[model samples]
Target chain A: MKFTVEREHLLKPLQQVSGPLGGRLPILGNLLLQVADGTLSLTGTDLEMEMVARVALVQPHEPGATTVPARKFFDICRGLPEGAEIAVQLEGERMLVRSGRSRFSLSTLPAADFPNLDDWQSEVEFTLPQATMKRLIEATQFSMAHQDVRYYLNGMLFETEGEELRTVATDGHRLAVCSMPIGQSLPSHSVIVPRKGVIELMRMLDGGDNPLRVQIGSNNIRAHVGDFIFTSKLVDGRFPDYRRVLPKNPDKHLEAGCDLLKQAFARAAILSNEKFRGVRLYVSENQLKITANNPEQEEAEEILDVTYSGAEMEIGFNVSYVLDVLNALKCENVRMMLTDSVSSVQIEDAASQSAAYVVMPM
Target chain B: MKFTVEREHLLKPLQQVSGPLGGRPTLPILGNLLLQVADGTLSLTGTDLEMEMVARVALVQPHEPGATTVPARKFFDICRGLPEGAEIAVQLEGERMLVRSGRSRFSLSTLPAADFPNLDDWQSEVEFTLPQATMKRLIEATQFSMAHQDVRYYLNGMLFETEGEELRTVATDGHRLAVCSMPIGQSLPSHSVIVPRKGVIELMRMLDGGDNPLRVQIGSNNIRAHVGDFIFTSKLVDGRFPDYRRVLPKNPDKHLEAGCDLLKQAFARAAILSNEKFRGVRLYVSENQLKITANNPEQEEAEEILDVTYSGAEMEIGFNVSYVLDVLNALKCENVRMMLTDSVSSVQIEDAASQSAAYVVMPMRL
Candidate 1:
């Protein structure tokens, strides 16, 4: 196979597919590059992760198939003499790559060695803008279980009802749920996309106003956006009912600028005991106070004047969970809904109700 | 010990002395601070390995002479609330440090129970300006021998020489030498300070330079420098030198711009082979054609071309020794001297008398 393509055009797709090859896992090889039918396609896959990118190529001869080492090939292409035309061809099992005054011959594995899973190919399909997909992933991916023994919880559940799409992820310790209005009615469906698959899909979705065409199969999910096509094996288990986990009555609530709250938490956490990982918050008449005490008998306390009128309440919670909620929301003001000392607290964007986060207290 | 100093004033000395009290070491007690008073002076010392720093603190009130534990003292000073008065006191036999607010009192360890090293008091009869001592040490310190197992090669030697008013240091590997010079005519008879002591003495000289003077003492083959009444000690050793009887040849040398030649040659040669040991250089020039070759047997070669105007015979020389000579001299182009090569033989730099380098040739086959 032989073709010529601009460096910029190939670089982005190479980076996108390479991200999911799981650099640490030996089970999957890096993505393979194939030139066939006058078009070049780069494909990468693991048991639960897969990505395929296609770009037009300038071909001088009949298209053929070959698989070159992904990382080394990309490096050679990136470092080729500036503005120089790169020529690549397959001679038996060796792929010879040359540009200007330099030439490198790399051994190739057969194209059949590449692993591409057969997606479920759902009958029901849905479409949304790339921006919507990006927002939903950012608001929930951080709360997903990582290497949790409870295998079913290690993925995000995508629940669809009519025109609203709700994405929820939890690691049992904290749960995040975000909803967006697709504005088009669709059949109700729910599926858990495994942790690795969700991460790979999020990487492929570049935030933009361009609409992303999505197809949800009985056992698989496929997304086509930009120059990349992403397909993933859906988790085959029931997701927890996140609705029942949220608190019904929140007794103490406070509204504060997200930046101010974040800063106060960071300062007060400095002197918190390293092992227990707990910080106390005291809220009373328009004021919020944070305090941390360490084994060394050192204390750090910070107070911020927030806009609140709730009854005075003192509670303890993990400082990291609150910080995570503030960071993920990306909103100016966050409304924190607290019920009591033991119940879960609800966090949401002050201006919108669609994206809600409920973090269980420690 | 009750006074308030701005953060700026305390931070400078804390940073300077903290270098000697680095975390990774045995003797947890060594990690503690050694605070004391002598003749109305408050001093702090941090020591580890063979180096120690004693910085003097200005005081406002006269108190009893005593010592206290150091760790919590530094921590409390670093973490106290900003732009506020901090009142500190040494109480209970220097066993606890009390930092007071309007009502709060933070208690910290005063390890008077742990033994600490006493600052050695050596008489310094020779004293000089801080700048002269600092400049002399800086020149030679860079080229000091790094940690190695060569017993005869004293891995930490800093050679010092005094010829009337001139002081110089010459540190070398078997291949090349770095020599630095400074003028010190004021407070010394002809003498040489040698090895490990020179490194620590240089550090102390740097730490005590601002507003304080360095007092030098000359003993029977021993040298010490005193700053703010704290004395640093080093024993001088006797050793013989290799005969530097020959310098580079003046007749066959050619001059080039130092910065351009050094950068281009280093970058090109770096791509040839990953050699951790010897880095060889081969120079070829004939009738304005200049080429540098650096290669390894794994079939890697880095060759670069430069333009020169030499109508004389072709010549090739070994790597880098001559290049370093040009760098050390810091000579302008107008003052440089050139000597063109005549035969297939490798040529070394000559300084009006003898050969300054010994170049090794590569074997014929891989």
Candidate 2:
């Protein structure tokens, strides 16, 4: 392909399109660049996921196509000076990139060898603001399991019904559920988006107010935003029903400043068992006490004034799990619901209930 | 023993003193702290038999004067965990030390203070005073070239030499050499000492990058820097350092002057296509033009051209792209001058305006 484009207009999209190119399949490691009618399209895939991006050409010389090593091309474009116009074209079996006084000759593979996910047909489609989608993912993505033996847990569950959309993630011990009102009707569906896909999707979202078009298929999910299209294969196993584990009702509720509680937990965690990471909390009428002891007989204790009026009680939990929830709350105060010492606790922002977290007792 | 000290008064010193104590020690007592209270001042010391740091805290209310040793890291952690300005009360009872704050308490195991190892008595042969910023710059300008885990043990440290009115620091790894010098205004007899790698690094961190005057003492077997209340002492290498004068290149006829930033950027871009093992790039110099090129095993090639001031006969030379980039990055000048004799001789690089610091890089046979 022969085309000249501004480095600014092409660099970002090139970086995004090359995200899924580094896989075992050698041909897939190349990005397909096709130019026609003053536009250049770039596509890359790892079979399980793919990203395609387009940038308007500054000077369209020929209508052709070729595949070049994605990483090298992107690196050259990134290293060049800003505002420099880059002229790219294919010469025989290699691709040439020229900018300023620098030139790069990169080996290329035939475009026919590139793989395309053409069979993915949408069964349902919906549109929502990019900010809303970004909020739904950020509130719960941290709770997703990492390489668990139960493969289905290694992804985030996206559920849509009527006018509400929800995202849930759990590692069997803790679960996070966050729902946002989409303000538009969508078909009811539940799909597991793998951890990698979730990460790539989050990286692409700029959190703007523009609409993000989403299409769901039986085996794949596609997203369209600004000049880019992203597709990821659905994880193939059934997810555990998260509702059963979420505590429906708890008798006692405690309110405390989120930052204050987080700091107290951090200090107590310093002396907690390095392996178990266990800490004990004692809640009374208006005070909460956190205590931890390691195997070396080192102990740490912190006390904070909290709004609690339930019967005096104590419970044990993994301090890290609590810290994670507190960090994600992003609110002034947090309300924690507790039952007996054996029941799981539910935590949500005191001002809003859009996001809820449940953690099992240690 | 009993004492009460504010967290602000003890946290920083404790952190600095505990740095050298983490290495494996022959005796557990060496790893522990050596704390002594006397004359209304509390001294905290940590050492690994090779390097030692002592910090003195004066804002202390000493109830009973005594000396003991406790775990350095654990004590520092407790001090750091306390809220700033909190009055910390610590006392010794039998085999443990009790630390009490507002509502937090800690009991730590202790060892006898009498067992702490002490460096042999020595006298300083030379002493000098300079701004802390100047000292920090002298160290950083050449620290990157110090050899790592080399059989030539003396090369693993920085060489400090003081003459009539200048103190110079030099380091080399055989492939490249970096030398930096600064004027101390007043100096005594000429002497040279090699401060080990770890000592140089720890001292670098202790410098606050201010204009405060720093006092340095060089002894027969140790080098000590007095930075405010912190006294850092590191044992010197016992071997002779390489003669850097011989490593410095002689007068070279060919000279090239270019903007430091532009040259650095070109070298960085060319590095991407250089061979992974050797990282070699070729430089072709012509009249007012320089071209940098590299090709890897994959047959991928990258070429960059930059305009420069040159009038020497056309010549091509090879160098490890990283070495060139490192020198350029350290110069911190608008323009740098490079002198070359031929394709096989080492090249000299220094700032175009002055020569306080000089760099030498060995040519590669690409």
Candidate 3:
């Protein structure tokens, strides 16, 4: 392909498309660059998922296509001086990139060797604000299990019901449920997106209020985000019922500064048992006390004046779980509901009820 | 024993004293802090056999002289978490040390201070004072060339040489050598020592690069530095360092002058396509401009041209792009002069305006 484009316009999209480009086969590490009808598109895939970023050609002379090493192409573009116009042309079996006093000659593979994800029909379609989707994912993505034997738990569950789009992630010990108002009635649907795909989707959403179109088929999901089309294979397994996993009707409740509690937990965690990371909380009439002990006999205690007037009670939890929920809330105050030491505790932002978290007892 | 100290007076020194406390200690006491209160001063010391740091803090209130060892990291963490300006009351109660501040309390387990290992006493044969910046620069200018985990253990540290009015530091890794020198302002008996790699790195962290004169004491097997209230000691590596005088290039036929940052930027860009394993890049110098080219195993190539001042004949040489970049970055000079004899001989590079520091990089076959 022969074309000239600004480094700024090509650098970001190149990074996005080439983000998932390495595999056992050399060809899989190559990105297909196509120039057709005054348009330039870059496509990268690792057999299971594909990412394509399209940009309008500033100067298109010939309609052609070829595949080049994804990392080198992006690196060279990034390393070029900013605002410089980059020119690319194919010569024999090599591709030439030039800008100012610099030139790079890259080896290319036949465009036909590039593998594309098989085409599938969309069974469900929806559109939502990119900001809303980004928030929902960020709020709950950390709870997804990593390499779990229960394969479905290794991904995030996307559920849609009447006028609400919700995401739920759980790792058998902690669960996070976040919902956003979709403002439309739709048939209820649920899908489990693999861990890597969920992470990539979250990164691609730059948190703008612009509309993003999503399409889900029997075996795949596609998202049209700005100039990029991201597709990933769905995890074919049933997700556990999140409604049953969430704690209900806890008798004791406490409201405290989110940052205050987070810092206290961090301090207590320093002395907690290295293996179990267990920290006990003694909640009484108007105060909350936390204590941790390690095998080394080292101990740490912290006391915070929390807004709790319930009966005195004690509960033990893995400090890391509570810290994660508090960090995700990013709010001034949080409300934590506890029934007893054995049951899970439900925590959420005190001012916003859109997201709730549950962490099981240690 | 009991004493109270403000968090401000104890935090930084705690971090520095506890720096060498947690690297697979031979004894559990090696990970404990040596707290000794005597004559109204609280001295905190931590060591891992080879290196030790002692930070002395004068207590707000005096206490009877006493000493003990507490868990190093735990005490430091408790002090770090306490509010600034808070008075921390620490006392020994049986086997545990009770640390109380405002409302936070920590009872950390303690080990007997008598078991802590200390670097054996040594006589300081030579002592000198230099601005902290000089010592900091001496290490920064040459430490990166030190060979890491090499069979030739002497090359895994920096060579410190002091002779009539000059304190010099040299480091090399078989392919490249860096040499830096500073005037010590007085003539003294000549001395040479090799400071281990870890010692050089830890010393770099302790220096603040200020104008204050720092007292450095050199002994037969140890080196100590007094920075304000902190005393730092590191055991000297017992080996002979390579002779750097022979590695420096003598008279050369070709010489080129170029902008230091400009050459570094070009080398970095060309490095993108250099062979990952060899990192070789070719430089073709002719007239007043230099052309840099590199290609990897996949046949991908990157080429860049930079302007320079030269009067030598057209010459081509190959060198590791990473080594060249390191020399350029360390110099931080506006202009650099390069001298070379042929393609096979080592090339000499130094700051164009100063002759105190020089670099030599052995060429490679392209």
Candidate 4:
């Protein structure tokens, strides 16, 4: 078989499916490259999350299929001349790539040995702009539990009712929930997408205005981007009820500039205990005070003006947790509600209620 | 007593002397950073036998002027990481240095200044004015070819040939040689000084390629460069530098020119499939096409092609891929020109537009 494709045309597809290329798994790590007269597709999977990308060919050769090492093919293609179209042909078990006067012969595995994931059963379907999906994932992904024994807590929960979509993640300490008023136009459904699947979906989204289709099954999640068909098995366990952890109305409410609070917290964190990383916040009439001190007597304090008129109170929290919510809000003003010093604090964007966070008091 | 100095002003000189702070600073004099105050100026110096650099800060608050050495690494780390515009105050309490800035304080152990030895003195006999830009290129263009731990100890350093209005730098590892020169535009006595690799590196680091003028003073046994508030001194290597003129190829029988970037790209890819050990890549030249082929014991083969003009008879030449890569990357030109006599002779690569500076790489059997 002989076919011609541009260096980058083939390079982009291989990159989308390159996640498991470093594992060096026998036969499994090799990408299944199928070439037809008009379509050339590259599929790579670790049995759980499968990524398939189709690219256009410059000159079609005899329709054929083969498997070559994923990373090695990508590396050789990257080093070729810019804008140079490569002629690829199958010679015995070796793949010959020719560009200009340059040629490379790489060994290939039997195409029949490569395994394919079971086709997903689509139960719920939703279409949205790629950028919106990317934003929704980014908003709640940070709260996903890392290395949690619960297993289910280590994944994100995607819920939809009629045409509204909501995502939630909690690590037993903090919970983040993001909502988009309209993305779905199907029956209600909910699923726990494993952390690995969430990561693959995010990387596949190009932050473009183009449409993206997400298909959810009983045990797998599939998404179709501009030219990529992605599938990943879902976590079997049920996600924790995140609504139980979110705090309701609190005693005191305060609003301050997101950038202002973020900077003040960063300065105070410098002197915080390396292991504990605790910082105290004192709120009074129209003012917020932050202070942190290390065991060596190094101290840092900042007092910033805010909009608050509640009973003066103080709360202790891990400065990193506070910074995470402030960074994710992406708004001019950040609002926080405290129900006493010991209760979890609810942080929200004053501009809109699309994203909200709950940070457990330390 | 306490003295406050600008954060940036103090950090600059401290950085210049912090290079040799690690690796069991053998001598008490080596581990400590000696800070001296006189005439309201704080001067910091770091040195070994091969190289020395001294930088000065103008606004040093003098409190009963005295000098002492403090732990180098810890002192510099705090100074660099402090909040910007921090007024740093350093006071000596016996052998302890209390470093205070903003809300932070660090008490560091210090050494007696009297225990630190003075840097070697250099008496200048010949001096001249050289543009900092010209000086930087001469050293950097050839310094990469210096040998490493070779029995021919002289090859481990760079040679500086100073004549009336011309200055030349040459370095060779026997397998490959690099030479560069520029007219200093001044008349002066001729001198030759072999600067060790460390010294050459530090001199280049201190120089930025701008229109700034630099003062060069060659003493009997040492060389000093003065750039603004910084002074860099290097001890000359004793061994004689090898004669580079004898190896230069002349009256090229065959030559070719190719885009500088394209040639490098093809060469780099072919090198990936080359033998992992004992580097070798064959270049076949005929007419206007140059083909590069490389193979390894693993049955892997790579062949790359480039466009050039070579009307002479065909010939195949082999050279270490890394050596060819070095000359191509260092020469900042749009095109590359290669000249050679035959397969058994040396091939010279240089800036395609000008023949002023070039690198000569001898062929190796593939």
Model 2 chain A: lowest-lDDT 10 consecutive positions: A19-28
lDDT of 2: 0.88
Candidate number of the best DockQ: 3
Worst 10 residues of 1 chain A by lDDT: A22-31
Relative to the true structure, candidate 2 reaches a TM of 0.96
- For B177-284, candidate 2 gives per-residue lDDT tens digits of 999999888956789999999899888887877666789999999899998888999899999998888977788888999999989888888888889889999989
The TM-scores, one per candidate, come to 0.67, 0.96, 0.97, 0.81
C-alpha lDDT (0 to 100) for residue A133 of candidate 2: 84
Candidate with more favorable, higher TM-score: 1 or 4: 4
**Cα lDDT for residue B55, candidate 2:** 90
Tens-place lDDT digits, model 3, residues B142-228: 999999989999899999999998899999988899999999797877899999898888788788666557888999999998888
Query: What DockQ does each listed candidate score?
Result: 0.12, 0.55, 0.70, 0.24
Off by more than 4 A, model 3: B62-64
Q: Please write out the lDDT profile of model 1 over residues B1-366, one tens digit for every residue.
A: 333334444544555555556566577667766666556666666666455566676666555565665562344353343224434343443445544333223344556634766544456444454453454344434343222334655434655555466555644444444355556656456655555534444454444445566655555455655665454445545555443224323354443222333334333333233222445545666676566555544333444455655566666665552333333243212221234444343233222221221222121111
| Top candidate, metric lDDT | 3
- Candidate 4 per-residue lDDT, tens place, B1-366, comes to 356787888876786766534457668667777888777777777766467788887753655477888767657766775667878888888767777765555566777888886667658998888889888888878888999878888888898888778988999987899999899888867789888777888888887566668998888788888988778887888887777887888787888889988899888888877887866899999999999998777676888988797798899989888899999988968989999788888899888788768899988777
| Docking level of model 1 | incorrect
Better of 2 and 3 by lDDT: 3
User: What TM-score does chain A reach in every model?
Assistant: 0.94, 0.97, 0.98, 0.95
- Total clashing residue pairs per candidate? 16, 0, 0, 0
- List model 3 lDDT by residue over A1-362, tens digit each: 69999999999899898877785679898899999888899998877788888999867568899999898888888888779899999999999999888889999999998887898999888899998888999999989999999999999998888888899999999999999988778679999999889988887886666688999898899899888888999897889887888777887889999998987888888889989999999999879999999998888889999999778888999999999999999999999998888898999999998999999998
What is candidate 1's local distance difference test score? 0.62
Instruction: Please say which candidate is ahead in lDDT: 2 or 4.
Output: 2
